[PDB]
Amino acid sequence: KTAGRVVRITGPVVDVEFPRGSVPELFNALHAEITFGALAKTLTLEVAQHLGDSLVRCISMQPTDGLVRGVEVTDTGASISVPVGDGVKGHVFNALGDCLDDPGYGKDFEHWSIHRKPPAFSDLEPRTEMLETGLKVVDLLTPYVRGGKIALFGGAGVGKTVLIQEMINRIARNFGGTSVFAGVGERTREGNDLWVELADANVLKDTALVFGQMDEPPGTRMRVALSALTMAEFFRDEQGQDVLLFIDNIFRFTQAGSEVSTLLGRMPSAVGYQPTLADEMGELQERITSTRGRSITSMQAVYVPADDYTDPAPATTFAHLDATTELSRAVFSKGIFPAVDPLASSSTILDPAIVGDEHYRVAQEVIRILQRYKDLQDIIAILGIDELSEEDKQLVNRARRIERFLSQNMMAAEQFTGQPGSTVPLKETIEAFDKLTKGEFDHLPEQAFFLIGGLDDLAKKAESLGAK
Amino acid sequence: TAGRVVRITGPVVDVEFPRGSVPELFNALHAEITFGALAKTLTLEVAQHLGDSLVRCISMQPTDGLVRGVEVTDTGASISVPVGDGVKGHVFNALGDCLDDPGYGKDFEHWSIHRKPPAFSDLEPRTEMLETGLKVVDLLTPYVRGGKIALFGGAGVGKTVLIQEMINRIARNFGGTSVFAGVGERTREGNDLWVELADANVLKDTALVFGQMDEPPGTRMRVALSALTMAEFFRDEQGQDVLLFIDNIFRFTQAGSEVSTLLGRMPSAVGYQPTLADEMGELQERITSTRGRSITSMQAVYVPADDYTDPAPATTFAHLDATTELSRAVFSKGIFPAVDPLASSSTILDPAIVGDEHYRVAQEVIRILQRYKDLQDIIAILGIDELSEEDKQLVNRARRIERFLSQNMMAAEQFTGQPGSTVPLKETIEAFDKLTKGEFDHLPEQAFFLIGGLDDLAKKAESLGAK
Amino acid sequence: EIGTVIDAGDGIAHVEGLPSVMTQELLEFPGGVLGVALNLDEHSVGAVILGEFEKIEEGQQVKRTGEVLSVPVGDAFLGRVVNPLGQPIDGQGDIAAETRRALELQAPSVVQRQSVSEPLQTGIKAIDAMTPIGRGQRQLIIGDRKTGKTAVCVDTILNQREAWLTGDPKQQVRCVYVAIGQKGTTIASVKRALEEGGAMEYTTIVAAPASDAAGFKWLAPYTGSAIGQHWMYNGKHVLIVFDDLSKQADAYRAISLLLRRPPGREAFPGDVFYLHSRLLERCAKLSDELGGGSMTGLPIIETKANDISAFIPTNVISITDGQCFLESDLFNQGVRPAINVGVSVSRVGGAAQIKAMKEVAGSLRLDLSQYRELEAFAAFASDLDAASKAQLDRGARLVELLKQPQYSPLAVEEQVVAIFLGTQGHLDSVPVEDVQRFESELLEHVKASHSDIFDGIRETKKLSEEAEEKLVSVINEFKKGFQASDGSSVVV
Amino acid sequence: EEIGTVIDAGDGIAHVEGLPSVMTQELLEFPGGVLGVALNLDEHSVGAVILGEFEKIEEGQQVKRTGEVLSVPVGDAFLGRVVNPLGQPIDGQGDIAAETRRALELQAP
Amino acid sequence: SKQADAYRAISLLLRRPPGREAFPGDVFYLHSRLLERCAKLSDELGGGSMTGLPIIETKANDISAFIPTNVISITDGQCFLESDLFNQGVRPAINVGVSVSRVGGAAQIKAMKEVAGSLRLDLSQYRELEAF
Amino acid sequence: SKQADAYRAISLLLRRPPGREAFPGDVFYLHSRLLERCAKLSDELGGGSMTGLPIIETKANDISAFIPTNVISITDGQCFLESDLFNQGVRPAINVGVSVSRVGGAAQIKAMKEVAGSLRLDLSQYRELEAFAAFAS
Amino acid sequence: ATLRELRGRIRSAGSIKKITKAQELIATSRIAKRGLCGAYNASRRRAMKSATDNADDLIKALTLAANRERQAQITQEISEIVGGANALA
Ligand SMILES: Nc1ncnc2c1ncn2[C@@H]1O[C@H](COP(=O)(O)OP(=O)(O)OP(=O)(O)O)[C@@H](O)[C@H]1O
Ligand SMILES: Nc1ncnc2c1ncn2[C@@H]1O[C@H](COP(=O)(O)OP(=O)(O)OP(=O)(O)O)[C@@H](O)[C@H]1O
Ligand SMILES: Nc1ncnc2c1ncn2[C@@H]1O[C@H](COP(=O)(O)OP(=O)(O)O)[C@@H](O)[C@H]1O
Ligand SMILES: [Mg+2]
Ligand SMILES: [Mg+2]
Ligand SMILES: [Mg+2]
């Protein structure tokens, strides 16, 4: 007739044979039924390849356990579509658009396909407006861009999720637009905690949550980001809102793509990744851009495997970001929070033409001092600071104080220490770091600079340690 | 009795022939590209007999525009190149076509580029020193007349500049023929060499064979064989001394590895063809001097990623009589030529040939440099003052020695603006013997940088104020 | 002849039929889609889809154009942004193409060229004085991310503004900027930087953003090369930037793996070196008989963790006429541009400089390399000799001199005067921390009071003896009034 | 009943022809009380990962369906017991009164 | 770790191309789908819970390897026992600086919190102080 | 090493499964089979013998590579030659610290065994004391 | 390249270790009877013992990193070889 049947089942990937002339288009959503009592469900398959001889290779959005060869597969005629509109705000959805906190919600909404072309080149406008988060390190050394793309890199357990929560607390709370949070291959309990916290903070009503978590087939883990991006794109294009898009974690999208590619029979590229890694990343990222007159301020957490920043996934992700904040294990070991690597992190608007001459000068002086400290660290590890010249000893003391002062007590860190977070205005940050570089605070103890706010807190803690 | 194209994947073409008409291995086949913008005649070298009357061949020219099932004509012989004195003073590609004068040499005698190496009986070792005039080469890496010389080094360490310097210092006064083989190098370099040889009136004695890095792998693999065939004709028939310059030999291996997988071969270590050493051995054993017939071969060897343990240079090392390894560290210190004195070697750098004094001075210099290398890290961390007085004296001596091994080369005038200099062997030995005895410890080390002999040393010292 | 798509997926297709199809031929798939035939065997034809492959389906009819890959070319492409097919993407309308040019055309032969002898001023003191670039040269801008590679290339493009304004074809340089795998907003910002500096009047942008299929990212450098070659063969001078070629390598590797060609190092295809080498050998300095035109290439390579031993960086280094290494460690130190002096070189050498720059900067690169070596050696010296102290002071002053901010190009004469200051010992009296300011101020003085020196250098390309003496006198007179931050007099 | 046949076996893997109605991740019985899990299903055969003594698997052996999707017995009877990953007691204390069977690949909350 | 080794063996015997350290691409999926089922169910589902205590064997205290980082990215904190403290005689050899409990602060009686909240970072810093 | 490389080329051209460094699974077998024919026959078989002196060329003094590891395992003793000693003037550049002969004194005449007994201790102690050559006092 | 750099750093640290141990012993002898003193200006035997211990720790860390890189290089080389072989299968 017009319905195909399953011929091969190799994990999440399923081959479906269709009658001649009825082969579905690429990315079309097909439906199959698993009837076994425990695993009974309706698999949604996505057509991935045309194999020839009327065969198609498709990625299953649900576990294919219990699926039988030869069962009927029906073509929906369209790709996976998700609900869009103001209704999505304040509700939790999965990758397929099903509402989790209220099943059946949104079935009557407008539905948009999760596959779309990025905005035309003529519609793109570079963004250079700074975004004042309130963190010393971010504001000084890698200022964020409003309407731009921000990324947080780092290995396992360095503070990616805590920093995402911090930025949600510092940006989303005082936000007149819409927020979309895409949990991609993350802890499910983390998603529940975010749901509860946004409900408590009253930010949930303005936020749309889309969760495809660790315990999902790779197809779902690689399509949930597209679903959330579709919601955000609807909010940007149709309603003319300022959209915040938080993704955690994009590397999980890349890794799910790698798993699918292995299951699709594609030959692997370096480090076993899919050959199409850069192209898939480019599609997904370029869809996340902000167009002329319509702003999406995205913020993505990028997991770095084995703390290897040379890994292909973050290596390709680097080029899609206006602001980059790389979290270092070495910094984390010192207890510095956020565990940012000031030398590795970068921002495209940290130039004197945008942030002013004073901010740029102070940032460059801080970076130079930290670079010199890093260069000296190799002699230091062997011989203390005792063998350095007088200038080098002074610079090392200044650099240690600066790197302690780059740490801050964050709002999201209260649940770990009980200490309420602090906010430092950009002007105060520039003034304090100018003073540090000039050597005005060199007489205070190192611990006076650890996990504090501005200059007032610095003075209070110096007093607490018996110092000026 | 002609074949037809069946498969085309880049530079590898499968051709099907009628039964009994299968071409012999290495035969040259002709195919036609008729596309207006890319009309040409592909030359295909039979590489494999696939069975069922199919043969896999490497295309010497780009295969863009080729169509499946087109006529393929078997020439019945391997790729041939013109031979004779007429080749001298002209530029040819891997197929023997003249570039400076198209159609020239089509009437000369033609020799197949595939040949066997000389019989082991005819081979006879060579031990005569070849004096160049470079302090480092003359002292630590003496060259052999009629022997095999190599200039190893990564990218941009001075292999090509040193090849030009040796052309200036050896080929200009040479009483025999010279053959230059530009194997997979920059076309600009080929044009520069052509113009330079024309200016110095040395082109008339030189035959140039160029296969550039923008040509398909087949040309890069067979250009060296073409040039070696011309050199072999000069050695065996004319019976006159031959100078053979190859730059870069590693390009032959790289092109061989490019088509290896496309030919069905499984990759060896470091993604090299399994027949790396076999092809290298054939090509390098064809480059040699026989009893009474002398070929002085100088080859520039690229070391991938400055890694001397790479299978290509490692395999190449065994085929050389004298090796000059250029080092990235020496290059980055500003020392030119960027020779690594500790890693260099010469089969004739023993007392029996070079004499007792030369050997003693060279060994003392090598020992001092090795000790300085050992103390490099201690100096870097703890400082020089913590060394013993003898160690400090040795460190100063070694710094001055390493600066003195540098020289201003004639071919480097366009890079430093300073005219080159030549140092006779005896002066080099005397100066380095004086250096190893501490006779110049008072002079600043900067006085020893990029100079010639002892007269230049005195001039530079008095310019800096020392004496 | 009409073939049938026997399978499709991931931007690749296999099509049966078309027995008379050429290798690299341009095939038309329904809906206006375009493919390139790469693999030809008796079974079928493998094709790379150049865009919107989601519309390809099994059984679709495929037509053969009969033309190998080619792009429109003409002067109408100046100031326009186009995709690797030459189709405008800036939304400004159709481009009037003078003619067409195949992408795979052989580079100029070894006898069709002439030695590189014309400077291509980048306006950057470090490059112009230490690793000069001539017209017809391939200079590799290689380095880690966020090291200023795009800054160097965009500054080089902008510095051609005066040459373009001269109106003399022998002096004008036409620019092509190929962006491969770059985020679209980054290309937009680059276009903005060129427009604010009035560089789009003579610049074309070939854009293959990361959203484009791997085919466009693989073709874009060849499209830009063909567009530049059309001008080059008509007596014009062209500067072409590839940003980056590593993205080309990644896209080509993806295409090859999808076509199931056996890979090699880092899963790259065996012929990736051939790809880059045949792309970069078309940047040449043509002989006078061919019009004397030239194309100067500025390929950009990004190294991960400063690992220049990787496959693609090694290949590209071995291909080009010199390299310009940029280091993040040098960048953070304040050395901007962060050019590593010891490892950066230009194989053209002094032939790419004017006579004055050649005389002032004869041994600058070697001097700075030796200075870095000595500085490393004397890191913990307790009592340095006199010669070593003098060398260290001179090297520190030179390093300060070579520093330069962004979007601040210097005319060749001003660079000549600055290097004259540095290498003639006139900065020995000035404290290191003030050198920069001193330099700048002196230039302005010579600009406002003794401009005849600049005109003499710019018209004769040589610093005459009388001009040199006048410059020394002016330098001393300015030193008299110069105010050092530390308060020390800079006289004598 | 449905019965397939081993078409090849090696190093912990087996291939079974037949069993048209086998599920994905189904449990298959090979002679001698050996078990396998069907991972790869294709038009030709089924690739099964063996769980236990693989050395008893021979070509031509008769393979039977179990009807269960990689499940194990579950119940309070497992307290104080030592079992293998299949839920079979290995402490030698007799059978385990399993309340029911639970599939191993059920989604998380 | 031994489960990961066994799964790698099975995958290689299936001729599935491997990735880092010869492990397949879905080893992370293996461990993550295993450990996502240790949850604290809501009161609607009965309020029951399963507590996971996965064990991982590192080589030479290398917690930056592939599988250790995967599991760290999966679990809610780790208790890193380092061989140095164990051999010195400090047992249990908890590494104060690295060990952490992401969701452990709430799950702690009042007295234990009040007494040990300081102790944690106090020892974390006293390691560094004793370094001198 | 060159024999192993040639055998690897032969095996790869025969499509045999490659292992570490692309060598086949019986390269160690190749070398062990070659080198176990060097024996010391019993008096019943004439008492003849064949002594093997295989050579191995390491790269960057990497004795942990595949073929060097195999051959070191096979042989009864090793003479490690280092280019650093060679450049120091120590020639033959045998590293006495790491070179070993498992046959030992059984392969020496009585006079050689007596005279050479103290040599090992003296050389080891000299290597220990090397660092103090600057402070003889 | 990283493996070669690690090996070079290991030999550097080893030389530092031997020189520091020799200095420590000589300082002990002198006690029984320049700036390498630990913090006298801000004793030399204490500083040299600390330097030798730090060099030991650095050598151990560098050796661990070098062994990790050796294993990674072997695994990646085998990965490329087997990928090519499978492609040609
Ligand atoms: N600012 C902070 N103050 C105190 N502790 C912190 C801070 N940031 C992070 N931590 C500690 O680090 C742990 C890990 O942080 P987080 O979950 O944000 O990291 P991550 O990079 O997202 O980790 P993973 O890869 O496991 O998902 C937190 O549970 C908390 O224990
Ligand atoms: N000479 C310079 N002085 C000061 N800042 C500079 C200089 N050159 C570049 N920068 C700044 O350095 C940052 C990196 O510049 P650029 O985009 O050219 O680098 P890149 O290496 O091409 O980066 P990417 O990897 O993002 O492509 C930008 O902020 C640029 O403004
Ligand atoms: N004697 C020398 N003096 C100064 N510079 C030199 C000398 N020899 C080589 N160089 C530098 O080394 C670089 C590489 O030169 P070349 O030999 O052409 O490349 P390769 O070493 O890769 O063959 C050149 O850019 C040149 O500036
Ligand atoms: Mg997290
Ligand atoms: Mg060269
Ligand atoms: Mg850039």
Residue numbers in the entry:
A (entry chain F): 7 to 474
B (entry chain D): 8 to 474
C (entry chain C): 30 to 521
D (entry chain B): 29 to 137
E (entry chain B): 275 to 406
F (entry chain A): 275 to 411
G (entry chain G): 3 to 35, 86 to 94, 258 to 304
What does the paper say about this structure?
The membrane domain of the mycobacterial ATP synthase is embedded in the IPM, with the catalytic F1-domain of the enzyme extending into the bacterial cytoplasm and attached to the membrane domain by a central stalk and a peripheral stalk (PS). As do other ATP synthases in eubacteria, chloroplasts, and mitochondria, the enzyme couples a proton-motive force (pmf) across the IPM generated by respiration to the synthesis in the F1-domain of the enzyme of ATP from adenosine diphosphate (ADP) and phosphate by a mechanical rotary mechanism. The mycobacterial rotor consists of a membrane-bound ring of nine c-subunits, attached to an elongated central stalk, made of single copies of the γ- and ε-subunits. The mycobacterial PS is made of two proteins, bδ and b′.
The turning of the asymmetrical rotor brings about a series of conformational changes in the three catalytic sites, which lie at three of the six interfaces between α- and β-subunits, leading sequentially to the binding of the substrates ADP and phosphate, the formation of ATP, and finally the release of ATP. As in all other F-ATPases, the F1 catalytic domain has threefold pseudosymmetry with each catalytic interface of the α- and β-subunits separated by 120°. Each nucleotide binding site in the three α-subunits and in subunit βTP is occupied by an ATP molecule with an accompanying Mg2+ ion, while the site in subunit βDP has ADP and an accompanying Mg2+ ion. The sixth nucleotide binding site in subunit βE contains an ADP molecule with neither accompanying Mg2+ nor phosphate. Similar to the prior study, the electron density maps for each of states S1 to S3 has density for both tethered and untethered forms, and hence those particle classes contain enzymes that are auto-inhibited and others that are not inhibited by this mechanism. In the tethered forms the mycobacterial-specific extensions of the α-subunit make contact with the γ-subunit. In the untethered forms, these regions are disordered in the reconstructions and are presumably freely moving in the adjacent aqueous environment.
